[PDB]
Amino acid sequence: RCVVNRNGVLETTINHFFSRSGLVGVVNLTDGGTTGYATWDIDIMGFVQLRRKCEMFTYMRFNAEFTFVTTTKNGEARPYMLQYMYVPPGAPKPTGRDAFQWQTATNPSVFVKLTDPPAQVSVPFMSPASAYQWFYDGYCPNNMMGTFAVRVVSREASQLKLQTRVYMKLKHVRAWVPRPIRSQPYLLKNFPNYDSSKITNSARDRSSIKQAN
Amino acid sequence: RCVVNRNGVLETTINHFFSRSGLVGVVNLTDGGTTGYATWDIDIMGFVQLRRKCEMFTYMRFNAEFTFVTTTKNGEARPYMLQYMYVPPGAPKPTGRDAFQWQTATNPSVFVKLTDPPAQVSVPFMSPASAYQWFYDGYCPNNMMGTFAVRVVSREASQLKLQTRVYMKLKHVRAWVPRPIRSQPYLLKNFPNYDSSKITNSARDRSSIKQAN
Amino acid sequence: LQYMYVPPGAPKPTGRDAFQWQTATNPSVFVKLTDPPAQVSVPFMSPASAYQWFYDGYC
Amino acid sequence: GIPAELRPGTNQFLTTDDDTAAPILPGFTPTPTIHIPGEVHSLLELCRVETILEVNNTTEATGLTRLLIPVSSQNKADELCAAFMVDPGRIGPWQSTLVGQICRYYTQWSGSLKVTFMFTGSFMATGKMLVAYSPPGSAQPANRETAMLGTHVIWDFGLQSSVSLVIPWISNTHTAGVVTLWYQTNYVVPPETPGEAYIIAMGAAQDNFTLKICKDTDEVTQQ
Amino acid sequence: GIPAELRPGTNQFLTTDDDTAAPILPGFTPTPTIHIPGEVHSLLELCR
Amino acid sequence: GIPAELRPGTNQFLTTDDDTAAPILPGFTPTPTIHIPGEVHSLLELCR
Amino acid sequence: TLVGQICRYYTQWSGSLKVTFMFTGSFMATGKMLVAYSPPGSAQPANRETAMLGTHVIWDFGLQSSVSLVIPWISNTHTAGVV
Amino acid sequence: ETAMLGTHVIWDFGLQSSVSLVIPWISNTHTAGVV
Amino acid sequence: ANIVLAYGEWPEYCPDKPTRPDVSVNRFYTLDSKMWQENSTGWYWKFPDVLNKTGVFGQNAQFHYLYRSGFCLHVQCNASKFHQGALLVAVIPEFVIAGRGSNTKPNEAPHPGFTTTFPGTTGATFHDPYVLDSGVPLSQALIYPHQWINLRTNNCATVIVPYINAVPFDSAINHSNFGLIVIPVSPLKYSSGATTAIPITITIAPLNSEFGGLRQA
């Protein structure tokens, strides 16, 4: 067609550029009787589809909503109780399935069944500074958020292998100090290391300089 | 009887002529372990009961509500997680069961169980022009709306054959430039092709011109 | 389970998978067996002003 | 934490329910509308248009000539030229019109109609013609006198080349009444002029035409 | 997202309940009423 | 004890839904913000 | 460029653009140069005359060491026009 | 088509039995233009 | 003469630079006369491609890429006082010509060529006028703006048609906006010794023309 009109100006802001429930985490669980607990220290730099969108800025500040969707090996609805546990920054991680870390009242827990709708919690801004930053020039994942340990609520044991997904959605996001978008591929998680040799150009080549390829 | 009174004038408008949750789509699924995903590019010209009612006009503009009702081969209520995914116009379709298209945050997804009430979503006006049109005299289904891919949420595989129905309801419909109703049968989907020979008359014949048959 | 309301004048369904079960004009109610019983409301659907069970004159 | 209870009708999917759904793209604004001419609001705007009736629907006729009434010469007075029914929602001449295709999506209708004739013939040819409406009950009249005792218009081929007869109130729940069309005097013609002309018949609804209870149509032989 | 709880009596079908139901034909207006003589209101008019 | 019914769309997880969630740390106040130069609001500031 | 990396996260765009040139050379070297915009449809011109019949700016290497040409309205749903 | 791209009058044999076309400014010092 | 305004609206300029010639394009372009006979079928014209090769309008419509205009139509059909017959003239927005065949397969089903869909300045004739070559009956074609040219009442018709499109601007080369159709519902009849065929003349005027985006050849 021919777009002669002007388009919308509301879906270009940061609040609409980030606030959408994507995927961040995939966690496994076996519970043989053979660790049953499943720790996951959260970092938003896991996938390369949000890291490229978040390393475009230098400082950020946001709240998060996490949704937990747990299925079975093939996928069933066995109504078993599951405990999610939020370990704030500084608190010790759980070491076993029935360790005392799973009983302390300070670590908030969520009890949900498998037949129930997926779980949903909200985590506020938990940084000692004024905002997050993914580029710290000076002298564990950067910008501690906290762990999201999970286990099955039972006394003796169980005989199923869970498989859960953690979907994160940002909300009330604010950005500061924009910076260019990284074009080179990634090599590490907490380091912007590129390859010395094999430098990919930012534009695929054409035949000559006097054409319209 | 004898209708001597006047009837209602509210059930003749376009808002009541179109807004009713009919059927548009029927989608299959096998999930052998043998494609498990099930794409369906939506077009409202599928059935010949809505195409005849929508080709009566030249320009239209509406929002849609889609309801997904999924049953088993015979029909059971196995509580398995299902993911519906809306692929907007321009976005690439999913190619496999566990392809990266099923993880991108931009394609909205709906997670529902089989024991739950049927799923229901709302799609707004998604055309680059000012309104849809089913007769483009000049130089994929006409008037791109977007795909409604579906899959079962599991890690390894499943051993059931789903069968789902997609019911569409139009809402906030506006019409422009009416045109006569097509009497000849159909031959294609995106073309108003009729048959040169075997032209069906618009009225069944009678004996003579001087009777009351 | 699918319940279907056939208004007066509309043709009845003839088979299990006939096209009468797909027409949008006949309202349908989808309910499971584990769910609470279904409930619908039907208004006054007579061409006259009121029903009458004694029609002296000439389903 | 307000207390609540669920009543019968929970978790049901009613087809004709007026219930909103959660939007898929929040904040996305659609394309602004422009002033496109020809906006329609109700189907009653489509019923008020004249439309050629197919009154010559008999056999051994080709495609187009089924829309023409053959008003020929070599005939005589008090002769039946052409007659037809009035029912729009019935298999007949009223199936080819637009009000006959619209009034089949619905199951009840009422109101008055209007049938307009138009004579396609030479300018030098004249002659009187009696159009006649006979209401329901009594059937088509046999002779001209019984037709002119009913409703009638004596339309000549003078300056009036398009007569219009209003049909009063014919409704659904019903014979139906017949529109007959008689040779009043003759079809006179001067030399160097063909003695065979035609009449196009058209028919539409009025402001009183109203509709109720929408059902499926059956002009489709497909799924 | 208001918090809510369900009490005893949930998902029950009481016969003599005064509860409305969803209409089947929305927007459909019925036939207007005329003045039919002999309207009764209670059965006490029949006992007299 | 208000009567209520559930409609289609119950217990579904829509990705692009604008729905709030229960906070994990209630009463916990975050760090106050300072005036950091270079705040951006929309991507149209980056295209220019 | 940056607008080419931003406008790929979205699927539709519109508006006008601006292309600015800058000459890195000696101060004692001068010479005239014809920049030319040709809208969509018609392709790149073959000779200078057809280019100067379209949109053009005759920019010399005098005091003006940075010329700027505004490209009008080039949109998504489309050849595209040649600079 | 080339004639109707120039100056033209579509004159029918209805009531108008006498059409009139004005020829603008044709002068001496000059082809001359064709009707 | 009676003027039937299409959809009750006058062709107007675009609301808030596109050029407006207003001098040499608002002139009466007259097409060649069509020869109506006994065994004729009808004719149709795709409008914004009829004047794409005719003079200043064709030049200024091919050398641009934006386009928005209306049209003041005029169809003169002058016959003798002894001939008889009737014509139906009508405009149709987005008049898509269908193909005649019996194939459901995509790559082998028939489709009209470039000369059939875009006739040009000479028009084209119908093949099955009872279905408008589109599978749509001609009995209810009166839903469009239309006039009856009856050979015993008048000999002219006018259709002032506005711009009917979803987008306010469009290319006038690869999109024919709307079509004109003339169909002899009542056939031609005359006695021996008269004129065997009747001429039909069409004159059109592009009211309120707007072009955008000059492009050098």
UniProtKB/TrEMBL annotation, chain G:
Cellular compartments annotated: Host cytoplasmic vesicle membrane; Host nucleus; Virion
Recorded superkingdom: Viruses
Signal sequence, renumbered to the chain: none
Subunit relationships: Homohexamer; forms a hexameric ring structure with 6-fold symmetry characteristic of AAA+ ATPases. Interacts (via N-terminus) with host RTN3 (via reticulon domain); this interaction is important for viral replication. Interacts with capsid protein VP3; this interaction may be important for virion morphogenesis. Homodimer. Interacts with host GBF1. Interacts (via GOLD domain) with host ACBD3 (via GOLD domain); this interaction allows the formation of a viral protein 3A/ACBD3 heterotetramer with a 2:2 stoichiometry, which will stimulate the recruitment of host PI4KB in order to synthesize PI4P at the viral RNA replication sites.
Family: Belongs to the picornaviruses polyprotein family.
Free-text function comment from the UniProt entry: Protein 3A: Localizes the viral replication complex to the surface of membranous vesicles. It inhibits host cell endoplasmic reticulum-to-Golgi apparatus transport and causes the disassembly of the Golgi complex, possibly through GBF1 interaction. This would result in depletion of MHC, trail receptors and IFN receptors at the host cell surface. Capsid protein VP0: Component of immature procapsids, which is cleaved into capsid proteins VP4 and VP2 after maturation. Allows the capsid to remain inactive before the maturation step.
Protein name: Genome polyprotein
Coverage span on the entire protein: 421 to 516 of 2193
